[PDB]
Amino acid sequence: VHHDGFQTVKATIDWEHPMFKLYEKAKRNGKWNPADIDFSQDQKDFASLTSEEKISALPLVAGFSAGEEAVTLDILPMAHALARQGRLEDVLFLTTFMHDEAKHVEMFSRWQQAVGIGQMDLSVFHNDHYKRIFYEALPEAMNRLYADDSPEAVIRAATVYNMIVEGTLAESGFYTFRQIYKKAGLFPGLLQGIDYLNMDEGRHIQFGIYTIQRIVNEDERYYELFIRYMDELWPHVIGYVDYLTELGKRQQQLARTYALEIDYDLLRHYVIKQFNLRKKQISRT
Amino acid sequence: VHHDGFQTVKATIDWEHPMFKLYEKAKRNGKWNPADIDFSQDQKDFASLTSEEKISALPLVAGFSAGEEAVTLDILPMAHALARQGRLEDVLFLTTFMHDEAKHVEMFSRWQQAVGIGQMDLSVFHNDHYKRIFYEALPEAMNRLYADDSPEAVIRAATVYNMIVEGTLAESGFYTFRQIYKKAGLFPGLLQGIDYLNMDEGRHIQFGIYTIQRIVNEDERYYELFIRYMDELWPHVIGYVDYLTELGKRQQQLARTYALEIDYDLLRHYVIKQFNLRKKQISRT
Numbered sequence: 001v002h003h004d005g006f007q008t009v010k011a012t013i014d015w016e017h018p019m020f021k022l023y024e025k026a027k028r029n030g031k032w033n034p035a036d037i038d039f040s041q042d043q044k045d046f047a048s049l050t051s052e053e054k055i056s057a058l059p060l061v062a063g064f065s066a067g068e069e070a071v072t073l074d075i076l077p078m079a080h081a082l083a084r085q086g087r088l089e090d091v092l093f094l095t096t097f098m099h100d101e102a103k104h105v106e107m108f109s110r111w112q113q114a115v116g117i118g119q120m121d122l123s124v125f126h127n128d129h130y131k132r133i134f135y136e137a138l139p140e141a142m143n144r145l146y147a148d149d150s151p152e153a154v155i156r157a158a159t160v161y162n163m164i165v166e167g168t169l170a171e172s173g174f175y176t177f178r179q180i181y182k183k184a185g186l187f188p189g190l191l192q193g194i195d196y197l198n199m200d201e202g203r204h205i206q207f208g209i210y211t212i213q214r215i216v217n218e219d220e221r222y223y224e225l226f227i228r229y230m231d232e233l234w235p236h237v238i239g240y241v242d243y244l245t246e247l248g249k250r251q252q253q254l255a256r257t258y259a260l261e262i263d264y265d266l267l268r269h270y271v272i273k274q275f276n277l278r279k280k281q282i283s284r285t
Numbered sequence: 286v287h288h289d290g291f292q293t294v295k296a297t298i299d300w301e302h303p304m305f306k307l308y309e310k311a312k313r314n315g316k317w318n319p320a321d322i323d324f325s326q327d328q329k330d331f332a333s334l335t336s337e338e339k340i341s342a343l344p345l346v347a348g349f350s351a352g353e354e355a356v357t358l359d360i361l362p363m364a365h366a367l368a369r370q371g372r373l374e375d376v377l378f379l380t381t382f383m384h385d386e387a388k389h390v391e392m393f394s395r396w397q398q399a400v401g402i403g404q405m406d407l408s409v410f411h412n413d414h415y416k417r418i419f420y421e422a423l424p425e426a427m428n429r430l431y432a433d434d435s436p437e438a439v440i441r442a443a444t445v446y447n448m449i450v451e452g453t454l455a456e457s458g459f460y461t462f463r464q465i466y467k468k469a470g471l472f473p474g475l476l477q478g479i480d481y482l483n484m485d486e487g488r489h490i491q492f493g494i495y496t497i498q499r500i501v502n503e504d505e506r507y508y509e510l511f512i513r514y515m516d517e518l519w520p521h522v523i524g525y526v527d528y529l530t531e532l533g534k535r536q537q538q539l540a541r542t543y544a545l546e547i548d549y550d551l552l553r554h555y556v557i558k559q560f561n562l563r564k565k566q567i568s569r570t
């Protein structure tokens with residue numbers, strides 16, 4: 001529909017808005033380019049591995065590649081909803097959020113291309129719980145915003161996207177990469193990419209917290225909805241984590257060859273810790 | 286609705302896609318930050334103008350500030366339409382397109398703030414023809430894509446957005462800024478911004494040309510639609526240009542003060558030429 005007028009004609013950008021300040025940080029801190037990462041040692045590393053050692057990292061990379069692609073596509077309805085609400089500074093920030101995710105998609109795909117598994121269909125490592133989150137719950141909650149931008153809808157979208165997918169699963173995946181492959185001295189280009197992704201995703205979670213909290217500030221009853229929506233998704237989070245753990249325990253050749261001690265119980269507790277920590281970052285009041 | 290699968294899990298990014306190459310160029314060439322522009326001399330320049338010279342500058346800035354804000358919001362439906370079509374490389378590029386427009390909004394608003402007119406409502410310089418394009422025709426054509434992503438809808442959207450708004454009006458506005466203020470020595474920060482904007486917008490127009498031409502390549506009958514949609518908006522393009530000209534001719538102190546021969550007939554001929562050049566960037570075959 002039509003534009004009634006424009007904020008930067010009637011007035012200016014709200015220079016003190018928290019999302020404008022986050023937009024400014026994103027420009028300053030967002031200059032990295034996946035095209036500059038040297039994957040040449042990753043290629044040699046991957047080639048040096050046996051077939052059974054090779055597959056060890058792929059379930060995780062499969063989860064990330066799909067995840068980054070999903071969040072790239074599925075942030076667009078949130079940007080649209082906030083734009084229609086006239087929240088210009090949120091929109092400015094979300095352009096950096098979307099461009100970040102584009103780079104994240106690119107980073108993992110560049111890695112797959114470099115190590116020679118670009119032609120492999122990694123969908124085999126998406127179990128039912130993963131599909132329930134990334135193929136279904138995430139796009140459903142986001143696409144809802146095109147026809148229902150109520151506070152309930154916006155909280156549910158930010159919960160699934162920012163607090164579960166990014167704030168629980170992605171953060172735990174970064175930790176896992178460091179606990180396993182950084183200890184093995186493997187895939188230095190991928191691990192460089194992970195470090196840049198982790199920095200970007202700190203801003204993304206701040207936007208989710210800002211968005212949920214500002215709606216909770218309007219009516220404390222929305223706090224109960226946030227907790228409920230978190231708890232609804234937990235079975236699929238831990239169902240996917242348990243699936244990745246089972247795969248890891250059934251193919252132990254990389255851990256043995258590299259004399260690693262992968263504590264899968266420690267990884268499980270980190271996911272639980274992230275989930276609970278995300279809940280603690282929203283307050284009823 | 287649901288994702289059926291993910292391109293970067295089943296395969297990789299299409300590294301040779303034209304919009305991937307444009308995305309790569311956008312990252313390499315899109316590092317500028319409006320927050321680094323020094324507007325201190327612009328502020329002194331504006332303060333030194335008489336009231337009658339001050340307002341001479343503002344119709345153009347009013348047209349740009351609203352325009353950049355409009356195109357920042359109104360690109361989201363195109364990104365959604367192409368995402369839904371599975372055009373991943375197009376989406377990656379459009380994240381750079383959207384973020385560029387955010388910086389363009391920011392640049393003009395920072396200028397307005399710096400020179401002391403942030404509080405002034407510049408909407409008074411939007412005549413009926415301007416409103417018909419930016420308040421109405423542009424958002425209508427873009428929002429259509431949420432419910433109708435037919436080739437006809439996509440061509441109309443890219444025509445209004447990329448070939449008229451950007452390719453005819455913004456390009457002529459950049460030329461106009463340089464014809465008036467570059468020779469005068471005035472507003473060096475704004476002119477620095479204009480130079481960065483013009484570089485960004487060169488990439489943007491290539492996406493519009495790519496998009497229109499790939500649809501024309503499937504059926505030459507869409508070429509006649511493109512020409513029709515351009516001609517449909519021409520009356521409002523020239524109606525706005527004639528309005529700005531009338532404001533310019535009715536206030537000549539800034540030219541006299543700065544020894545400018547502001548050839549308003551030359552600016553009009555530039556707009557006509559731009560319009561015809563954009564039509565010629567699309568080929569029937």
Ligand SMILES: CCCCCCCCCCCCCCCC(=O)O
Pocket residue numbers: 060063064067068071101104165166169170172173176201204241244245267268271
């Ligand atoms: C064995 C420990 C399991 C740890 C959890 C692993 C989860 C893999 C990560 C996939 C989700 C990535 C989502 C991207 C979200 C974003 O970038 O904003």
Ligand SMILES: CCCCCCCCCCCCCCCC(=O)O
Pocket residue numbers: 345348349352353356386389450451454455457458461486489526529530552553556
């Ligand atoms: C008297 C000469 C008139 C010249 C025409 C002036 C046009 C004003 C510019 C407003 C439109 C800006 C739209 C931005 C498009 C984009 O940024 O991709």
Ligand SMILES: [Fe+2]
Pocket residue numbers: 071101166200201204
């Ligand atoms: Fe993210």
Ligand SMILES: [Fe+2]
Pocket residue numbers: 129239
């Ligand atoms: Fe299960």
Ligand SMILES: [Fe+2]
Pocket residue numbers: 356386451485486489
């Ligand atoms: Fe543009």
Ligand SMILES: [Fe+2]
Pocket residue numbers: 414524
């Ligand atoms: Fe008229």
Ligand SMILES: [Mn+2]
Pocket residue numbers: 068071100101104197201
């Ligand atoms: Mn990401």
Ligand SMILES: [Mn+2]
Pocket residue numbers: 353356385386389482486
């Ligand atoms: Mn622009």
